[PDB]
């Protein structure tokens, strides 16, 4: 299962990033409607999850409490908005490397709240993976790093909530995805309506209807990814999903750099060898 999930998430999110860059950097005026883009993505993902439930998991009955889904959705939205605000306040690469350090906060929050215990081998493997990924990514005053720290904390809280949900309610992947996406859609729609970006985005889309096409395609990609991601969240737990995401980002960066043939600095060599060492140790004892 793990290789299949890795391959699917990697390719789907690579195409997702390509489409997101194409839409954002089109310069048709400038696209300053990120919030409505996330809202559309959430709506499409919710519709896809409903279709999957109706076609595959009709027999199952959801047992999770609604407030748990609401809490998970608000935590995820808070993480997203904090990361975007930090990116606005801080240079792009630093935000990327900060978001790459998800497993550490996820594990720490899990241990502190759910009282989970992990073997020190897992601790060392996760620390080594995170350090290697950070080192491989370019490595060179506050009030901008605090936002990244808050985003990491909110991501850890989301992981804790998902772990508790799956442990004590056996939540299905499709149900979890659908409910989280519905709550996120509600909150984002309320925020968009209040801020008024809905009308500006609608006028922008009417001026350039072609965007719609890409948007739809873009949204579809996200759906697929979320599915796999949520599967990885349920079958293996949030920590494994975080590690998978970080490793996927590292592999994408490594593939792009080697394709561009950018001189690989020795520090990047140490980073990649460390990432491989940690991944192998985790797999041998995973």
């Amino acid at each position: 299962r793990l290789p299949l999930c890795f391959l699917g998430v990697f390719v789907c999110y690579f195409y997702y990033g390509i489409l997101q860059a194409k839409i954002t950097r089109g310069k048709y005026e400038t696209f300053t409607f990120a919030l409505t883009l996330v809202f559309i993505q959430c709506v499409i993902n919710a519709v896809f999850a409903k279709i999957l439930i109706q076609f595959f998991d009709t027999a199952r009955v959801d047992h999770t409490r609604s407030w748990l889904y609401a809490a998970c959705s608000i935590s995820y939205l808070g993480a997203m908005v904090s990361s975007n605000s930090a990116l606005q306040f801080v240079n792009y690469p630093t935000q990327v490397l900060g978001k790459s350090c998800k497993p550490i906060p996820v594990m720490l929050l899990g241990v502190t709240l759910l009282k989970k215990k992990y073997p020190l081998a897992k601790y060392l493997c996760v620390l080594l993976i995170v350090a290697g990924v950070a080192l491989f990514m370019y490595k060179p005053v506050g009030y901008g790093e605090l936002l990244l720290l808050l985003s990491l904390t909110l991501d850890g809280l989301t992981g804790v909530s998902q772990d508790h949900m799956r442990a004590h309610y056996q939540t299905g992947s499709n149900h979890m995805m659908l409910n989280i996406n519905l709550w996120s859609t509600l909150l984002l729609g309320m925020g968009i309506l209040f801020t008024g970006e809905l009308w500006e985005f609608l006028s922008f889309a009417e001026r350039y209807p072609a965007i719609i096409y890409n948007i739809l395609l873009f949204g579809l990609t996200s759906a697929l990814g979320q599915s796999f991601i949520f599967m990885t969240v349920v079958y293996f737990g949030p920590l494994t999903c975080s590690i998978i995401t970080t490793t996927r980002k590292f592999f994408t960066i490594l593939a792009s750099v080697i394709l561009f043939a950018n001189p690989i600095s020795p520090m990047q060599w140490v980073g990649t060898v460390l990432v491989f060492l940690g991944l192998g140790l985790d797999a041998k004892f995973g």
């Epitope: 027999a59 009955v61 409490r65 442990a167 004590h168 309610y169 056996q170 349920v234």
Partner: single-chain antibody, 235 residues
């Protein structure tokens, strides 16, 4: 469906001894590292009492004497300082799959021998075979539109429990797939009742029917039970 087997049919123990009751499932009952097991205690002529959920968590208010252990397809319930109070039948239930099942039951015996929810069940005491039947469970002290599953269960002669069906406060209902074609569960919030209807009851349906309230946490737990109503089908 999963079949639960309890190795000791009946155990003879002395006061103060430690007793271990074993239960085994035909299939793994672990869902993401948590064992979906429950243990109930039923005294003679009384509804089963909920004791343990998750195979390791003692229900609040239960004495610390009881404890649960095991994993995979083997579980055990331990009572080290057994007293006269804990003399009853013990049932192990699995909530891993929709047709929740109870073990054959283990009997324990001694040598030398407005502030809560109230449920009341009503129904005919004697019914001829092939006649549609309808039992009504009325709830007082609580509203069936709040967050609680309301289940209909039955116990045959020999103390072999069998969960018939349930309805959630949202109206979502689940049935035992074996009986999904024969029974139907409905509710009436105006009177705060819920009804179970059986079509063409046969002589095999003689049993004591309980209506219980259950909350889902690490599996379905029937914390509160009705007093049970007998039903005898005879020619």
């Amino acid at each position: 469906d999963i079949v639960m087997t309890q190795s000791p049919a009946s155990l003879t123990v002395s006061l103060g001894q430690s007793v271990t009751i074993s239960c085994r499932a035909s299939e793994n009952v672990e869902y993401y590292g948590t064992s979906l097991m429950q243990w109930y205690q039923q005294k003679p002529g009384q509804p089963p009492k909920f004791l343990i959920y998750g195979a390791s968590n003692i229900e609040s208010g239960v004495p610390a004497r009881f404890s649960g252990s095991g994993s995979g397809t083997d579980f055990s319930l331990n009572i080290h300082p057994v007293e006269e109070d804990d003399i009853a039948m013990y049932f192990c239930q699995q909530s891993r799959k929709v047709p929740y099942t109870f073990g054959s039951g283990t009997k324990l015996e001694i040598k030398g021998s407005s502030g809560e929810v109230q449920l009341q069940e009503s129904g005919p005491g004697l019914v001829k075979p092939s006649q549609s039947l309808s039992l009504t469970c009325s709830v007082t002290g609580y509203s069936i539109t709040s967050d609680y599953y309301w289940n209909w269960i039955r116990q045959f002669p020999g103390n072999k429990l069998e969960w018939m069906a349930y309805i959630r406060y949202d109206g979502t209902s689940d049935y035992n797939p074996s009986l999904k074609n024969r029974i139907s569960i409905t509710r009436d919030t105006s009177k705060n009742q819920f009804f179970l209807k059986l079509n063409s009851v046969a002589t095999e349906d003689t049993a004591t029917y309980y209506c219980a309230r259950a909350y889902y946490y690490d599996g379905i737990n029937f914390d509160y039970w009705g007093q049970g109503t007998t039903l005898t089908v005879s020619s």
